[PDB]
From a paper:
Ciliary movement is generated by the axoneme, a molecular machine consisting of microtubules, ATP-powered dynein motors and regulatory complexes. The prototypic axoneme of a motile cilium consists of a cylindrical arrangement of doublet microtubules (DMTs) surrounding a central apparatus comprising two singlet microtubules. DMTs are organized into 96-nm repeating units, which cryo-electron tomography (cryo-ET) studies have shown to be a landscape of interconnected dynein motors and regulatory complexes. In total, there are 11 dynein motors in a single 96-nm repeat unit, and they are classified according to their location (inner and outer) and the number of heavy chains (HCs) they have.
To investigate species-specific differences between axonemes, we used our cryo-EM approach to determine a structure and atomic model of the 96-nm modular repeat of human DMT isolated from ciliated 2D organoids resembling the respiratory epithelium. The model clarifies the composition of human RS1 and RS2, revealing simpler spoke heads, necks and bases (in the case of RS1) than in C. reinhardtii. The simpler architectures of RS1 and RS2 may be compensated by a full-length RS3, which we show is built on a base of CFAP61, [name] and CFAP251. Our model demonstrates that human IDAf and the ODA are even more structurally similar than in C. reinhardtii because there are fewer additional subunits, including the α-HC and equivalents of LC5 and FAP120. One difference is the direct contact between the TCTEX heterodimer of human IDAf and the linker of the IDAa motor domain, potentially providing an additional signal-transduction pathway between [name] dyneins. The only difference is the absence of a MOT7 equivalent at the centre of the T/TH stellate structure, even though the human genome encodes a potential homologue (TEX47). By contrast, human IDAb and IDAe differ from their C. reinhardtii counterparts in that they have HCs encoded by a single gene, interact with a DNALI1 homodimer instead of centrin and dock onto different sites on the DMT surface. In humans, IDAb and IDAe are positioned in line with, and closer to, IDAa and IDAc, where they interact directly with the tubulin surface of protofilament A03 through the DNALI1 subunit, rather than with a regulatory complex or docking factor. Despite the different binding location, human IDAe still interacts with the N-DRC bulb, which has uncoupled from the baseplate and shifted distally. Our human DMT model contains around 25 proteins linked to PCD and 20 others associated with either PCD-like phenotypes or male infertility.
Residue numbers in the entry:
A (entry chain l7): 38 to 142
B (entry chain k2): 238 to 342
C (entry chain l8): 12 to 113
D (entry chain k1): 154 to 248
E (entry chain k3): 91 to 255, 373 to 394, 431 to 627
F (entry chain l3), G (entry chain l5), H (entry chain l4), I (entry chain l6), J (entry chain l1), K (entry chain l2): 1 to 89
């Protein structure tokens, strides 16, 4: 079964590992977000959720005093399918990672 | 398979700071900035920025436990057979006629 | 999962909820709610055997950069993803809808 | 003695009604029935990277905006503990 | 009370509805039970109607001197709560069926049609899945009941539902139940033509008047209804509605309580037969001990087979059953306002009927035409 | 009037409102039969005349270890139905 | 008019708009049940009436360390609900 | 290892500590047979790990109406034993 | 070292001083049991860290509408205790 | 009045309510001849008077092993009719 | 192996557990010629398999009125012996 707290802990571990010294740069940054989304997806594979489709979304942006809102309304089977998220935020950027695990019948 | 719409799932909420100079709130912004600078400059009257204590009074929670009274649980078996019925009746009539004969003397 | 149909539904929900309104963070939460609620309602009215995951990003246009990337995992023949970016003079709205067959 | 004055609404409840998030539609529930023999189907799942699909990544580029040079110090933010006092009801399952 | 005990064992001996604590326990179990199907709601609706009927029997059989006002209002509130919760559970089960069947906005089914027929509730649901403006005649299969929806309703995402369960109600009676016509949202405004079928248990001696329920006024009204046409051979009522809602067919409340003649003759010492001949029908009723039964009906000198025939029951349920079947020969206190009667003194009537029943075991009594011409203080009748 | 005797088992209360809890339980068992509805009636009534959160446990077989405010614990039997009512918040 | 008694705990202003804070807190407790809303109403009206630089916080279990202006600090109870209101701008 | 399946009925929780509540109830059912000691074990372990002022109700026939702080409510079944664990205070 | 997980609900800082808000609260929860002293420790430490115009509230059931400096707002849960840290001025 | 002497064989009961079982059996045999209706009349009167969790077995040849509440087991003879009345629930 | 047929007169159970009642009754009739020991065998087998508080009535003349839990009732004949099995408690 998809465990949101363990998935959140692993997501937080990767976010703290990678984004601790990361500043804003639009040149390196699309590749960085694609790599982060793929890496979070692959580590949720390595956790090993059987018969579970995985949806990972990463939204990172510049910090300048801006106004951001991230939220989701979704339509799943509430007994088997579940979700989590994490937020990293430093001097130069903000990062949001959302994970949605959906059991397949 | 039951599929249900989930609730509000907020993942991130960053309030803005950057308000445009062309925005309608910009003059309120500038007046608030000037008032905050005036406050940060002036400490005239007594201790103008005196730090004060306050604390809500609630709680004092103590412990007593409750266990319901256990209904005592007993198995029992009976014998409803007509032969036992007639034998029992013969036994009580025999003991009644036995005890009825001792009062004459 | 029709990507064009999902994109049209997402665009209709964004235009119905946000509109031509300027940036007000007191109303950003309500706009975020209404966009994905309308999108989810229209996807369920389509009623194809898909679990739907609809997420919204709403971003003030102050010059700060933003992006959205999704690396996900499914049966690629049946399930699909559709991300739509919308903007006005003051807003960015990036809505991602994922349909996953049952 | 100070008489308890009648409360006079002063317009700051209107912005609360603006700020309050209300769900426009009821929660929609769908039931789908499938035969048990079709459950436990063989799995054909594949990775979809963000670099593999054009729609999987969307970027808003950064630009120096001279309009947003007015550095306010003054954002009004509201928060609360997760709502409802939660007077919830539980009952044992009665046969 | 003993008959309550007996048929309580025979029909619902397991649930135990007769005690008020277990009645509130039933309210409790219906609140606990979720996702109730229509068949489950019907199966418990039998218990609901049994409880309402028992409370009505208590209120009508227990004398008002022995009935406390608290008891009367408690039983009436229990009846109203049972009716409202029962209709709410029918609505919940109908919503469950609608969300089971409709599913998609279009469903790829063309036009969903569902007819469910029960003893008390008859349901017709049609869904506009195709949204075809050219299809405006919604006719349910195997019935002539239908609608003629406008083009906007034929293009809209609607379902039309029929649920067959200021008008002076002292002058007019509601007959055939209530037809709840509704436009529900599927999960310039011409009147909609509605064709309905009259209930077979109701005899309309005239054309029924179509009235609609002003829910804001909480009364029946004759406005908003046009194109009223009645086919008595097919028992079909066609009428145009400006706005859908609860709709019922009414007739004047006092039409057949007046009659021509009567005769109470003894069959045995413990049995009599009362033959009452009206303008429309001759009703023979057999009275034995505490039970009365509908012996025979002669509808214009033609024998009519009724469901109530052959069934013995206590006098007040006999009156209720005949009134519900439409064989109302039991007048009310307001019946003299709308019926031409030869009003006698109530004390003279009470004494005369007491001696009538005392001598009814061996004497036959017949209607006298000189009763009409004797005054109020006196009564004239034939004896043998 | 259901003749169910109130048997006080554990009560750090004052005596006036112990009668209030007994009367509220007597009213709640008369109208309701679900133990959570009885717990709904007793707690909500105690919410209107004392104010803080309150917690009511009604049933015939339960064991509890709860933390209550001072002068705010009562546990009693109304016949064979055990009502636990403690205030915490 | 909910008769919630105003028990002023720490008063550091003039009496006129101590009454206004009591009156303002009465408005929010009647139309709202969420303490964020009660904090939002008193803050912004005091922003509207006594310069747009105030701060309000409302709740039942909260103890602060705050910086205010002299002649701009109150903390009071309207019934049980504790309301702290201070200007720091 | 007693094969008693955890049937979650209502859980305003997080999922890791849904497992902790199930594991602690499994240890409490295995170690104690009186429901007051089972409620003592589950609540006290949730006092040390997730702060004080928790409440545990353990039984087979009880109906409750309880006020809990948010993300701190679970009510589940371990076999035929119903465990109500909510936090207030 | 109490295992109270730091859950951040709303943050407008850097990671250097989101973590500073986490550790100073962890020191303040351990040192003080009264929420006013916990808020006293948090604001005093951050008055000497990021200029002496901060404000702190420590508690469990409250709501605020506060005005904050750029890059100087955070609201997080240290286990069950809700702590706001905003700088005004 | 039928002179059916009551023979008490096994009564985990009280003395006043042994007589209540005998008298309720006396009216049940007098009113009803079918043993399932005799069991119906005895059970409900015990359901109404004490608690609605009784069970009644009426017959001449039946061997049972029933689980009863203590002070709630009777098995007696009324003529040639054996009546087992036990409470469980 | 005696060919004692099982005709099910009344059954509020499931099919796999009605069959277990039939098979246990067939074993109980084989080993025990006494109806209470037949009833003791069927009930105690059902106590350990489908939880306690079962009741078994075995005999050749009995009219009963019993309260049973849902999906826990049967009344059936094994040859000429009617065996009544219900769960309550």
């Amino acid at each position: 079964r998809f465990r949101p707290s363990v998935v959140k802990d692993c997501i937080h571990a990767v976010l703290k590992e990678e984004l601790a010294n990361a500043e804003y740069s639009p040149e390196e940054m699309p590749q960085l977000t694609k790599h982060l989304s793929e890496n979070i997806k692959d580590k949720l594979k390595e956790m090993g959720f059987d018969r579970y489709k995985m949806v990972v979304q990463v939204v990172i942006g510049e910090q300048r005093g801006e106004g951001v809102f991230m939220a989701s309304r979704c339509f799943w089977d509430a007994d088997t399918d579940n979700y989590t998220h994490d937020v990293f935020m430093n001097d130069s950027l903000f990062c949001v990672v959302a994970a949605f695990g959906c059991f397949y019948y | 398979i039951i599929l249900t719409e989930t609730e509000t799932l907020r993942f991130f909420d960053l309030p803005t700071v950057m308000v445009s100079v062309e925005s309608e709130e910009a003059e309120k912004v500038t007046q608030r900035n000037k008032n905050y600078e005036v406050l940060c400059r002036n400490r005239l009257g007594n201790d103008l920025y005196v730090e004060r204590m306050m604390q809500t009074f609630n709680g004092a929670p103590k412990n007593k436990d409750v266990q319901c009274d256990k209904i005592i649980m007993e198995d029992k078996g009976i014998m409803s057979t007509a032969w036992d019925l007639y034998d029992s009746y013969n036994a009580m009539e025999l003991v009644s006629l036995s005890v009825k004969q001792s009062v004459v003397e | 999962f029709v990507v064009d149909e999902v994109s049209n539904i997402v665009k209709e929900a964004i235009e119905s909820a946000i509109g031509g309104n300027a940036y007000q963070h007191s109303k950003v939460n309500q706009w975020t709610t209404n966009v994905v609620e309308q999108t989810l309602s229209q996807l369920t009215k389509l009623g194809k055997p898909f679990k739907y995951i609809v997420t919204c990003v709403i971003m003030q246009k102050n010059g700060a950069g933003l992006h959205t990337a999704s690396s996900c995992f499914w049966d690629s023949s049946t399930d699909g993803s559709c991300t739509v970016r919308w903007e006005n003079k003051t807003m960015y709205c990036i809505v991602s809808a994922f349909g996953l067959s049952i | 003695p100070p008489v308890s004055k009648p409360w006079v609404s002063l317009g700051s409840e209107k912005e609360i009604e603006e700020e309050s998030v209300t769900e426009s539609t009821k929660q929609i529930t769908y039931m789908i029935s499938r035969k048990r023999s079709e459950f436990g189907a063989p799995i054909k799942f594949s990775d979809q990277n963000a670099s593999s699909v054009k729609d999987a990544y969307i970027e808003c580029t950064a630009y120096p905006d001279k309009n947003f040079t007015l550095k306010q110090l003054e954002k009004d933010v509201g928060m609360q503990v997760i709502p409802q006092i939660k007077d919830i009801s539980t009952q044992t399952k009665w046969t | 009370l003993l008959s309550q005990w007996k048929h309580y064992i025979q029909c619902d001996g397991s649930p135990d509805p007769s005690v008020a604590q277990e009645m509130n326990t039933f309210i409790s179990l219906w609140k606990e039970k979720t996702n109730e199907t229509f068949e489950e709601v019907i199966e418990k609706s039998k218990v609901v109607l049994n409880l309402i009927e028992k409370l009505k029997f208590i209120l009508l059989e227990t004398p008002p001197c022995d009935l406390q006002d608290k008891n009367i209002i408690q039983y009436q509130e229990s009846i109203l709560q049972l009716q409202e919760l029962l209709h709410l559970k029918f609505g919940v089960a109908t919503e469950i069926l609608l969300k089971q069947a409709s599913t998609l906005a279009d469903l790829d089914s063309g036009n969903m049609e569902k007819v469910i027929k029960d003893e008390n509730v008859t349901l017709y649901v049609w869904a506009n899945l195709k949204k075809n403006p050219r299809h405006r005649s919604v006719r349910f299969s195997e019935t002539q009941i239908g609608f003629e929806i406008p083009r906007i309703l034929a293009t809209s995402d609607i379902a039309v539902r029929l649920l067959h369960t200021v008008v002076d109600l002292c002058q007019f009676t509601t007959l055939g139940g209530v037809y709840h016509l509704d436009i529900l949202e599927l999960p310039a405004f011409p009147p909609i033509e509605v064709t309905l079928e009259v209930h077979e248990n109701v005899i309309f001696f005239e054309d029924p008047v179509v009235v609609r329920w002003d829910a804001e006024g909480k009364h029946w009204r004759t406005d908003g209804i046009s194109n009223v046409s009645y086919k008595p051979k097919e028992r079909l009522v066609t009428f145009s509605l400006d706005t859908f809602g609860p709709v019922t067919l009414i007739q004047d409340a006092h039409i057949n309580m007046p009659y021509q003649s009567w005769e109470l003759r003894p069959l045995d010492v413990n049995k009599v037969l009362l033959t009452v001949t009206t303008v429309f029908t001759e009703i023979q009723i057999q009275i034995k001990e505490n039970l009365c039964m509908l012996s025979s009906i002669k509808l214009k000198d033609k024998k009519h087979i009724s469901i109530l025939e052959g069934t013995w029951m206590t006098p007040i349920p006999f009156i209720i059953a005949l009134k519900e079947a439409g064989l109302n020969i039991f007048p009310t206190r307001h019946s003299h306002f709308y019926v031409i009667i030869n009003n006698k003194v109530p004390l003279v009537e009470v004494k005369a009927y007491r001696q009538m029943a005392l001598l009814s075991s061996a004497f036959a009594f017949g209607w006298s035409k000189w009763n009409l011409l004797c005054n109020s203080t006196k009564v004239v009748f034939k004896v043998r | 009037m259901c003749d169910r005797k109130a048997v006080i088992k554990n009560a750090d209360m004052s005596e006036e409102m112990q009668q209030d809890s007994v009367e509220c339980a007597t009213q709640a068992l008369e109208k309701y039969n679900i133990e959570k509805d009885i717990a709904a009636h007793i707690k909500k009534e105690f919410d209107k005349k004392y104010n803080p959160t309150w917690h009511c446990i009604v049933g015939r077989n339960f064991g509890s270890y709860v933390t209550h405010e001072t002068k705010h614990f009562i546990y009693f039997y109304l016949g064979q139905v055990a009502i636990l009512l403690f205030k915490s918040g």
